[PDB]
């Protein structure tokens, strides 16, 4: 009875969805109400880092729910303290604020940057972000998101934001001034179609932020929590931000977000910012379980090997298939761009019809975002399914 | 063992906390790491509607976690669809959008209002909200939040917001214009110290929104989900908004938020707004469990009786204790205001020392926000403990 053909009318029409009602999932597979199995190379849009309903995650959720779900930030709880320690120790050693989502994490970052700048000067509230970036949908994050189509209906947005071309050193440099309090960057742009930063570009952004006394903020909501083959992309690049935001895979499915700051950026005082749900024991328990799994000896090294193997197969496909214009990415975050004559959305629909789930993105791309636990055989099955789709496109 | 005495070092200093690490809770009671039991009249700030770790909620969480935690809004899931149906049918019959938090629900409402306004005119983007309101900390919601102390460090905020005095018909009338797309009101202001709207004031807001073609938006994040003795406060008042926002108690401790719209306010299109985590099956399963419990025959009527019983005891206390200036609220949302010579924060600390947890708010108040499952004897115990505190204050 409860099915998308019957219950759609209770939901606002905010999404373009594939026509499936999913009721059960394990690992890389998800099942509709009829028991049809789908190979899930979406991971819920880069969230299901350990796949669906991973047994260790499920056991931690069950255990914690029996003990304490929510107490608020009037008090301290053990999962929140443990997760803050683990995030600090596995990054650049700073302090943590828990939010519930990526956009909320980025909003906290914006607020940190504004407070940092305002201490120096009332004029130092400008924020730079990239054209084609995606930082979230709440109004602060939406102003940072360098995509007019998402902004226009909701204007006027937050004053003081300006945009530069991703990977264009000189364009970033020429937009800097002493009035800038932060530069926001995705180390790999996601929604725009999987576009890795060059190391030179990130190194430049770091130097500029140092020269103009601005905070360098890396949005690792999509590329973070193991997906590049290191815990965070910044660790692959060797460029350390002042502020790092994370969400998506942090909870392995359970909603959570976080901001990590160095001492320079540790500017918030009691009352400046907060959240009812953020830092709750249930979500933080999930995050503890996830970070412990990802940091086990050898886990990330095997993600890197799997990323290399998937990339090799897709590069072979790119050479062979004239409709494939480009393949790019890092680790298990990979975009496949098609020639203009072929619709990315049609490719995704045909994949879906053949029981493979992929995520469309800009620049006429689909994204392969499998769970980090994805098996070599599942990688091959996904590539073969995509090839079969392209043969008939 | 993990404890706030050490682990505070990993957390940003964004909160003024009571000095307790809590590890376990059931019902109206929460326990520290030493096994001391505290009577929790915070409900995690109006969140734990069924108390801590209610067995039916816990069972639902465990069952859903074993099945499917997160699939994203690329697809449909049964809990999301069921919860949307239940929210629609138990309110004014509209459509639902799932967010993760109160602030995110209010951000969606702002965006709905702007989309609505822009259909009529490019100038019709202005939003009105009340002085001393609280709508959230993300930058859209923060602009709606009528509290300069929370805004100033982060300016400039979103242009086009203006404020009026809560319960002041003349001030609301003055601020209306054809360029207003929404009026935001908490039916009972929470953070300001539990200040119910008058029915007259809400009826006037409804008439004015009709006259100026604006959306009336009720923020029921704190007063909703059963706390006033009806599912939503608007149902006690008999004034129906165009848009309703809810979070906190919706998930019984699991993070979730929602916006409900009538057809007039049903204006978002695919791509206009979205969220990774919003509408996930785990959180929506919690929401289904909660709404089914609250809507059981007699449940809300008993919340009303308990509210009346608590209010009677507090009114007797007010008459008896000169340091108590006022008691106000509705159902189990109650504020106790002290004479200026007595610090609400000192009262809350002394309650804490005597194993009763309460939530400070504005206007020199403490808030009693017990779970809606609070027992009559627990009510008496809280009141007796408070009285003992006031005897030595
Ligand atoms: C890089 C990036 N930042 C922020 C977000 C927003 O995260 P959320 O949907 O959890 O609010 C996303 C999700 O699309 C993202 O890809
Ligand atoms: C009336 C009201 N609106 C919005 C919010 C913000 O909710 P959240 O902390 O879940 O973002 C709250 C919480 O303080 C609330 O009391």
CATH number (domain holding residue B242): 3.40.640.10
The residue of chain A nearest to residue B281, with distances taken between CA atoms, is A23
* Same domain flag for A326 and A376: yes
- Smallest Cβ–Cβ distance between B12 and the set A58, A82, A268 belongs to A268
Chain B CB contacts of A105 below 8 Å? none
CA end-to-end distance (rounded Å), chain A: 35
Query: Which letter, b or e, does each residue of A165-180 get, where b requires 16 or more Cβ atoms within 10 Å of its Cβ?
Result: ebbebeebeebbeebb
Whether A11 and B157 lie within 8 Å, measured CB to CB: no
Chain A CB contacts of B280 below 8 Å? 253, 255
Tokens of A50: 């350990």
Residue B182 and residue B113 in contact, taking contact as beta carbons nearer than 8 Å: yes
Question: Domain boundary residue among B247, B273, B297?
Answer: B297
Whether A15 and B269 lie within 8 Å, measured CB to CB: no
Question: Domain boundary residue among B279, B297, B315?
Answer: B297
Q: Cite the beta strand spans of chain B per DSSP E.
A: 21-26, 29-32, 37-40, 76-77, 95-99, 126-130, 161-164, 180-185, 188-189, 195-196, 215-219, 243-246, 257-261, 324-330, 333-338, 356-357, 359-361, 365-368
Residue A167 has what DSSP assignment?
T
Q: Which atom of ligand 2 is nearest to the CA of A275?
A: 9
| Residue B220 to residue B186: CA distance in whole angstroms | 6
Which of B181, B147, B178 has its CA nearest to residue B163? B147
Q: Cite the beta strand spans of B12-100 per DSSP E.
A: 21-26, 29-32, 37-40, 76-77, 95-99
- Smallest Cβ–Cβ distance between B73 and the set A17, A159, A282 belongs to A17
The residue whose two tokens read 């309703």 is: B244
Domain span at residue A385 reads 1-53+298-393
* Same domain flag for B273 and B312: no
* Same domain flag for B325 and B293: no
* Same domain flag for B8 and B155: no
The two counts, helices (H) then strands (E), for chain A are: 14, 18
Which of B200, B166, B122 has its CA nearest to residue B362? B166
Mutation for testing the B interface, residue in A7, A118, A125, A137 having most B CBs under 10 Å: A137
* Same domain flag for B186 and B267: yes
Q: Whose CA is nearest to atom 8 of ligand 2?
A: B102
Residue B208 and residue B214 in contact, taking contact as beta carbons nearer than 8 Å: yes
Ligand nearest to the CA of B217: 2
- Classify the phi-psi angles of A119: left when phi > 0, otherwise alpha if psi is within -120 to 50, otherwise beta: alpha
Tokens of B177: 């214009």
Tokens of A215: 């905070």
What's CA B121's distance to the chain center, in Å?
32
What number of residues does chain A have? 393
The two counts, helices (H) then strands (E), for chain B are: 14, 18
Count of Cβ atoms closer than 10 Å to residue B279 Cβ: 31
| Residue B108 to residue B114: CA distance in whole angstroms | 10
* Same domain flag for B374 and B286: no
Domain with residue B309: its CATH number is: 3.90.1150.10
Count of Cβ atoms closer than 10 Å to residue B13 Cβ: 15
Ligand nearest to the CA of B255: 2
Count of Cβ atoms closer than 10 Å to residue B6 Cβ: 11
| Residue A33 to residue B95: CA distance in whole angstroms | 24
* Same domain flag for A364 and A261: no
Which of B208, B210, B218 has its CA nearest to residue B185? B218
- Smallest Cβ–Cβ distance between A139 and the set B68, B158, B278 belongs to B158
Instruction: State the DSSP H helix or E strand holding residue B73, giving kind and residue range, or none if neither.
Output: none
Whether A15 and B115 lie within 8 Å, measured CB to CB: no
**Binding site per annotation, positions of A for N(2)-acetyl-L-ornithine:** 137, 275
Question: From the CB of A184, is ligand 1 less than 6 Å away?
Answer: no
Question: From the CB of A94, is ligand 1 less than 6 Å away?
Answer: no
Distance from CA of A70 to the nearest CA of B (A): 5
Which of A233, A128, A219 has its CA nearest to residue A172? A128
| Residue B74 to residue B92: CA distance in whole angstroms | 27
Question: From the CB of B293, is ligand 2 less than 6 Å away?
Answer: no
Kindly tell me the burial class for residue B211, based on how many C-beta atoms sit within 10 Å of its own C-beta (0-12, 13-18, 19 or more). exposed
Q: Which atom of ligand 2 is nearest to the CA of B190?
A: 16
| Residue A157 to residue B68: CA distance in whole angstroms | 37
Experimental method: X-ray
| Residue B220 to residue B200: CA distance in whole angstroms | 18
* Same domain flag for A137 and A232: yes
Residue A187 has what DSSP assignment?
S
Into how many domains does chain B fold?
A: 2
Distance from CA of A291 to the nearest CA of B (A): 16
Residue A88 and residue A96 in contact, taking contact as beta carbons nearer than 8 Å: yes
- Smallest Cβ–Cβ distance between B18 and the set A66, A75, A110 belongs to A75
* Same domain flag for A266 and A390: no
Chain B CB contacts of A273 below 8 Å? 14, 137
Instruction: Mention every residue, 6+ apart, whose C-beta is less than 8 A from residue B134.
Output: B145, B146, B147, B186, B189, B190, B191, B192
* Same domain flag for B291 and B306: no
Distance from CA of A200 to the nearest CA of B (A): 31
Question: From the CB of A135, is ligand 1 less than 6 Å away?
Answer: yes
Question: From the CB of B219, is ligand 2 less than 6 Å away?
Answer: yes
* Same domain flag for B93 and B209: yes
Which of A280, A52, A12 has its CA nearest to residue B98? A12
DSSP string over A356-367: EE-EEETTTEEE
Residue among B103, B150, B220 to mutate when testing ligand 2 (max atoms within 8 A of CB)? B103
Find the helix packing angle between A281-294 and A299-320, rounded to 10°: 80
Question: Domain boundary residue among A297, A323, A347?
Answer: A297
- Classify the phi-psi angles of B364: left when phi > 0, otherwise alpha if psi is within -120 to 50, otherwise beta: left
Whether B139 and A150 lie within 8 Å, measured CB to CB: no
* Same domain flag for A117 and A181: yes
| Residue B276 to residue A333: CA distance in whole angstroms | 17
- Classify the phi-psi angles of A374: left when phi > 0, otherwise alpha if psi is within -120 to 50, otherwise beta: beta
| Residue A282 to residue A64: CA distance in whole angstroms | 6
């Amino acid at each position: 009875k409860i099915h998308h053909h019957h219950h759609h009318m209770y939901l606002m029409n905010t999404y373009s969805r594939f026509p499936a009602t999913f009721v059960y999932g394990k690992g890389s597979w998800i099942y509709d109400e009829k028991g049809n199995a789908y190979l899930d190379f979406t991971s819920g849009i880069a969230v299901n880092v350990l796949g669906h309903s991973h047994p260790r995650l499920v056991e931690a959720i069950k255990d914690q729910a029996e003990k304490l779900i929510h107490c608020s930030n009037l008090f301290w709880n053990r999962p929140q303290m443990e997760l803050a320690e683990l995030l600090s120790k596995n990054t650049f050693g700073g302090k943590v604020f828990f939010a519930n989502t990526g956009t909320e994490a980025n909003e906290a970052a914006i607020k940190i940057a504004r407070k940092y700048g305002k201490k120096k000067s009332e004029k130092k509230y400008r924020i730079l972000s990239a054209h084609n970036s995606f930082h979230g949908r709440t109004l602060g994050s939406l102003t940072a998101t360098g995509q007019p189509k998402y902004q226009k209906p909701f204007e006027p947005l937050v004053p003081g934001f300006e945009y530069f071309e991703f990977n264009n050193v000189e364009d970033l440099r020429r937009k800097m001034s002493e009035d800038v309090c932060a530069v926001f960057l995705e180390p790999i742009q996601g929604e725009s179609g999987i576009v890795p930063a060059t190391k030179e570009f990130l190194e430049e952004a770091r130097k500029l932020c140092d020269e103009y006394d601005a905070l360098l903020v890396f949005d690792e909501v999509q590329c973070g929590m193991g997906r590049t083959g290191k815990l965070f992309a910044y660790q692959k690049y060797g460029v350390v931000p002042d502020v790092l935001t994370t969400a998506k895979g942090l909870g392995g499915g359970v909603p959570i977000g976080a901001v990590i700051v160095n001492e320079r950026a540790n500017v918030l005082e009691p009352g400046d910012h907060g959240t009812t749900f953020g830092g709750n024991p249930l979500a933080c328990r999930a995050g503890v379980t996830v970070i412990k799994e990802l940091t086990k000896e050898g886990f990330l090294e095997e993600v890197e090997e799997k990323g290399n193997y998937l990339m090799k197969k897709l590069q072979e496909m790119k050479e062979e298939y004239d409709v494939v214009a480009d393949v790019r990415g890092m680790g298990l975050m990979i975009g496949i761009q098609f020639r203009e004559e072929v619709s990315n959305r049609e490719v995704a629909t045909k994949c879906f019809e053949n029981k493979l789930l992929v995520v469309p993105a800009g620049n006429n791309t689909i994204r392969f975002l499998p769970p980090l636990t994805v098996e070599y055989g599942e990688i091959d099955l996904a590539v073969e399914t995509l090839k079969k789709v392209l043969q008939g496109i």
